[PDB]
């Protein structure tokens, strides 16, 4: 019944369309097709007591395929960055992401996640990254194949939205 | 009238009429009157304030796309100068009297205009008058000045910093009528300002020259002004002050030599007295924690630039014990471990992502531990003994909380056991360590106060095992092996497991395992006994004290084998999508796979497993899990005696071969890959 409008705001190829489809229905899609513009996947989920939409508004990484970058954040609820932990450039440009995400929802609970917590964990990024320290930043890791902490960013972006820590699916 | 019909499809869902939205946004734009639209869409009130955001978003789209004929992303459709000068005195409009999401976009909007025109020169006064002009009026030039502060290049820097610092520090110096927010974000310009400046200044020079250099003094005397005052009382601005302080400081250290002697007296009594209101408000409790934060932040950089390093050691043993003050559990954080272990399990890790005072205060410690071992080892000893001292005294009294002291004392003092457990090889203090483990750590395990100090004291026992009498290893691991029973809460069998794992490192570094030779079937017992109650972060632990305990006597676990290979199997399977779970079970097969003893049981238990999953369809059985099963196959054979065993060339080499051959996953084929080139490995 209440529908929550969340966003991701993935740079590069780091997965985010592979996340949305494993959490919709499927298996991991191994092939790269980089989206362009939105593709909002709607995705409801059921709780202990009530139950919750997260119409996934899926972004752009890339800046030729971007359409209208900050177009369509308004109106957000939450958002999740993005970042592979495989990858270097993916995470040194967060701040700018994060710059852009909060100017125009003002201060929704944003969850720094990294994808794909098989292969190498903090590779070339850093052992450590120090962006989620003192803001209102939830830091995590999961993963779109293994499907690791794959529920973990929702339940805590559900419990901040209703309020209860005590929501669970 | 229908230009606004748009913008409702680009805000919308379905993705037919998202498209054609864009579309039509991407069409119409090629006509002149598409600005003027858009800011009297979005300046004009009475009106759906997504809508507003919507236009001055495209608005910024619009200036960065079809502005400047030189930008490198520039549209045919160039900006006519009749648009231009109607919305330049149509958009500044805003700023004004609405909620701060449309304030923001239209500041971002003339952000956008702005870079452009500012060698061009048309008026950039209006927002200047609106900074006399009350409020919601200010707050709009605020965030343009710093969205415009943050776009200006190395080009136009040199000459805007001497413009917007002068009336930068005009504003701040005025606290008469810019209240506390303008004020701090005032400051947050000039720290943005300096640090692009200086960045230049590596690049290029030109910043720490004729130009501001000066008024960076004038800031800086205006600044030690500042923390002072206890009105002006917002605490979010002593941080924004303090921020830019250490942005002062780790810059150009060198004009900062002259007045920074005054600077830190200043800091040291925020310090303390934020020291006091922080126990009183938060710990004992029926944007602090982020003046807490740069404080710290402020300590780290002071113990960076060499000539400001002997600065922080002079008063160290005066600093180790508010830090030791600000690293008590608060009430806050007690509710939440006891109400969720996972989270208690994930925080008090020492490898975490949360960032609590607790946390910051203990990096700061670490730091200022392994910058000066022995100093500050004698300062903690110092500061310990007095922290017991006042516990003692407030203890008498029976005070309700004085219990946390307790806590952060044993957390300070094994936290950095390396230096202190060193220093007192040698006697280069006189810190009574026997003492210290007799009165302190022990005799408060027999203590019902709460249960957080129980957990804290078994795990600080597990650090000074090198220097303890053997009938107190026994009574501390006979406490510990109680520890781990369903009777005691959560929270303190953690803890017990985690004083298992460093009894099992250092006994054994010690090689004196003999002693816990006697202890290990209970050990083990209620380690399997835990991992099956909670599931996911507590396993995440407990696996890893059993690698260690396996590691501890290999004869103990050649007599109870039977008892940690299915639990492990069953383990690895279940939650097998880990990475820590899947790294860990490989130990636990590589540390198991030495006992020769073993090898029977092992394998005949594990190889139908392993190849039951290599068979499996790769559609079937969860992802990654192939890639797990042929790593500890590898590892098996690999750590394994030379002479193989018929289970593996009978199974094991022809399941992995059909595996490596039918495979397409890349994963797959590639730890596959290290497989058989260790399967070579035969003599
Ligand atoms: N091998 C492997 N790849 C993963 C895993 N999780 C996510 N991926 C990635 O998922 C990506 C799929 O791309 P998308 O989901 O569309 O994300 P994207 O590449 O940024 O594309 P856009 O959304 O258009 O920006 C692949 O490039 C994979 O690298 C994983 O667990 N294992």
């Given at each position: 019944?209440?529908?929550?409008?969340?966003?991701?705001?993935?740079?590069?190829?780091?997965?985010?369309?592979?996340?949305?489809?494993?959490?919709?229905?499927?298996?991991?899609?191994?092939?790269?097709?980089?989206?362009?513009?939105?593709?909002?996947?709607?995705?409801?989920?059921?709780?202990?007591?009530?139950?919750?939409?997260?119409?996934?508004?899926?972004?752009?990484?890339?800046?030729?395929?971007?359409?209208?970058?900050?177009?369509?954040?308004?109106?957000?609820?939450?958002?999740?960055?993005?970042?592979?932990?495989?990858?270097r450039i993916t995470y040194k440009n967060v701040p700018n992401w994060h710059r852009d995400l909060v100017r125009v929802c003002e201060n929704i609970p944003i969850v720094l996640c990294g994808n794909k917590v098989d292969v190498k964990e903090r590779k070339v990024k850093a052992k450590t990254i120090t962006f989620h320290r003192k803001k209102n930043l939830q830091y995590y890791d999961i993963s779109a194949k293994s499907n690791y902490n794959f529920e973990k960013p929702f339940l805590w972006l559900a419990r901040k939205l209703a309020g209860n820590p005590q929501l669970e699916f | 009238e229908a230009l606004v019909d748009t913008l409702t499809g680009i805000l919308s869902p379905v993705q037919e009429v998202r498209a054609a939205a864009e579309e039509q946004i991407k069409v119409?734009?090629?006509?002149?009157?598409?600005?003027?639209?858009?800011?009297?869409?979005?300046?004009?009130?009475?009106?759906?304030?997504?809508?507003?955001?919507?236009?001055?978003?495209?608005?910024?789209?619009?200036?960065?796309?079809?502005?400047?004929?030189?930008?490198?992303?520039?549209?045919?459709?160039?900006?006519?100068?009749?648009?231009?000068?109607?919305?330049?005195?149509?958009?500044?409009?805003?700023?004004?009297?609405?909620?701060?999401?449309?304030?923001?976009?239209?500041?971002?909007?003339?952000?956008?205009?702005?870079?452009?025109?500012?060698?061009?020169?048309?008026?950039?006064?209006?927002?200047?008058?609106?900074?006399?002009?009350?409020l919601n009026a200010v707050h709009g030039a605020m965030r343009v000045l710093?969205?415009?502060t943050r776009e200006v290049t190395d080009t136009q820097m040199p000459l805007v910093a001497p413009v917007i610092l002068p009336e930068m520090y005009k504003i701040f110096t005025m606290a008469e009528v810019?209240?506390?927010?303008?004020?701090?974000?005032?400051?947050?310009?000039?720290?943005?300002?300096?640090?692009?400046?200086?960045?230049?200044?590596?690049?290029?020079?030109?910043?720490?020259?004729?130009?501001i250099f000066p008024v960076v003094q004038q800031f800086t005397e205006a600044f030690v002004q500042a923390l002072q005052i206890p009105p002006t009382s917002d605490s979010g601005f002593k941080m924004?002050?303090?921020?830019?302080?250490?942005?002062?400081?780790?810059?150009?250290?060198?004009?900062?030599?002259?007045?920074?002697?005054?600077?830190?007296?200043?800091?040291?009594?925020?310090?303390?007295?934020?020291?006091?209101?922080?126990?009183?408000?938060?710990?004992?409790?029926?944007?602090?924690?982020?003046?807490?934060?740069?404080?710290?932040?402020?300590?780290?950089?002071?113990?960076?630039?060499?000539?400001?390093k002997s600065t922080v050691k002079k008063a160290l043993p005066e600093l180790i014990y508010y830090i030791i003050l600000y690293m008590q559990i608060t009430e806050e954080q007690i509710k939440v471990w006891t109400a969720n272990p996972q989270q208690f399990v994930e925080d008090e890790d020492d490898d975490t992502?949360?960032?609590?005072?607790?946390?910051?205060?203990?990096?700061?410690?670490?730091?200022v531990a392994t910058d000066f071992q022995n100093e500050s080892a004698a300062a903690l000893a110092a500061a310990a003994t007095r922290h017991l001292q006042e516990a003692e005294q407030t203890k008498n009294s029976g005070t309700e909380h004085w219990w946390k002291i307790h806590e952060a004392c044993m957390l300070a003092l094994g936290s950095v056991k390396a230096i202190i457990t060193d220093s007192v090889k040698n006697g280069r203090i006189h810190f009574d360590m026997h003492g210290f483990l007799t009165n302190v750590i022990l005799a408060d395990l027999n203590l019902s106060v709460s249960p957080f100090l129980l957990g804290r004291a078994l795990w600080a026992a597990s650090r000074?095992?090198?220097?303890?009498?053997?009938?107190?290893?026994?009574?501390?691991?006979?406490?510990?092996?109680?520890?781990?029973?369903?009777?005691?809460?959560?929270?303190?069998?953690?803890?017990?497991?985690?004083?298992?794992?460093?009894?099992?490192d250092q006994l054994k570094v010690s090689e004196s395992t003999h002693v816990l030779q006697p202890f290990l079937p209970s050990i083990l017992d209620g380690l399997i006994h835990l991992a099956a109650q909670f599931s996911s972060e507590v396993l995440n632990l407990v696996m890893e004290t059993l690698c260690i305990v396996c590691t501890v006597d290999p004869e103990f676990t050649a007599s109870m084998e039977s008892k940690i290979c299915p639990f492990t199997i069953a383990i690895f399977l279940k939650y097998s999508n880990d990475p820590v779970v899947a790294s860990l079970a490989q130990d636990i097969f590589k540390e198991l796979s030495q006992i020769e003893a073993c090898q029977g049981p092992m394998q005949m238990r594990l190889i139908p497993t392993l190849v039951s999953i290599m068979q499996a369809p790769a559609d079937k059985i969860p992802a990654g899990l192939c890639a797990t099963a042929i790593d500890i196959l590898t590892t098996v054979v690999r750590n394994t005696k030379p002479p193989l065993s018929q289970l593996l060339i009978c199974q094991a080499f022809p399941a992995v071969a059909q595996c490596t051959l039918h495979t397409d996953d890349n994963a797959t084929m590639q730890n596959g890959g290290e497989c058989l080139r260790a399967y070579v490995s035969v003599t």
């Open positions: 019944v209440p529908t929550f409008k969340l966003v991701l705001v993935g740079d590069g190829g780091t997965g985010k369309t592979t996340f949305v489809k494993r959490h919709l229905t499927g298996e991991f899609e191994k092939k790269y097709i980089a989206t362009i513009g939105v593709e909002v996947h709607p995705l409801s989920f059921y709780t202990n007591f009530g139950e919750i939409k997260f119409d996934v508004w899926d972004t752009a990484g890339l800046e030729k395929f971007g359409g209208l970058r900050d177009g369509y954040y308004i109106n957000a609820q939450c958002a999740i960055i993005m970042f592979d932990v495989t990858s | 119409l734009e090629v006509t002149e009157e598409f600005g003027v639209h858009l800011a009297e869409l979005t300046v004009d009130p009475q009106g759906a304030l997504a809508i507003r955001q919507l236009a001055s978003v495209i608005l910024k789209q619009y200036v960065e796309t079809h502005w400047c004929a030189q930008s490198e992303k520039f549209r045919p459709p160039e900006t006519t100068e009749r648009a231009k000068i109607v919305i330049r005195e149509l958009l500044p409009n805003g700023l004004r009297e609405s909620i701060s999401k449309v304030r923001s976009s239209v500041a971002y909007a003339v952000s956008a205009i702005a870079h452009w025109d500012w060698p061009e020169a048309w008026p950039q006064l209006f927002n200047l008058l609106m900074e006399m002009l009350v710093t969205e415009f810019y209240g506390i927010r303008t004020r701090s974000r005032a400051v947050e310009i000039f720290t943005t300002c300096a640090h692009m400046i200086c960045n230049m200044e590596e690049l290029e020079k030109g910043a720490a020259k004729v130009l924004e002050v303090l921020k830019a302080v250490t942005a002062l400081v780790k810059n150009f250290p060198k004009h900062m030599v002259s007045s920074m002697q005054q600077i830190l007296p200043i800091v040291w009594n925020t310090l303390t007295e934020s020291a006091a209101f922080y126990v009183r408000t938060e710990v004992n409790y029926t944007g602090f924690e982020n003046l807490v934060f740069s404080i710290f932040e402020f300590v780290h950089a002071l113990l960076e630039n060499s000539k400001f992502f949360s960032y609590t005072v607790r946390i910051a205060a203990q990096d700061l410690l670490l730091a000074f095992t090198v220097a303890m009498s053997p009938e107190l290893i026994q009574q501390f691991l006979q406490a510990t092996v109680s520890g781990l029973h369903e009777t005691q809460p959560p929270s303190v069998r953690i803890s017990a497991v985690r004083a298992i794992w460093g009894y099992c």
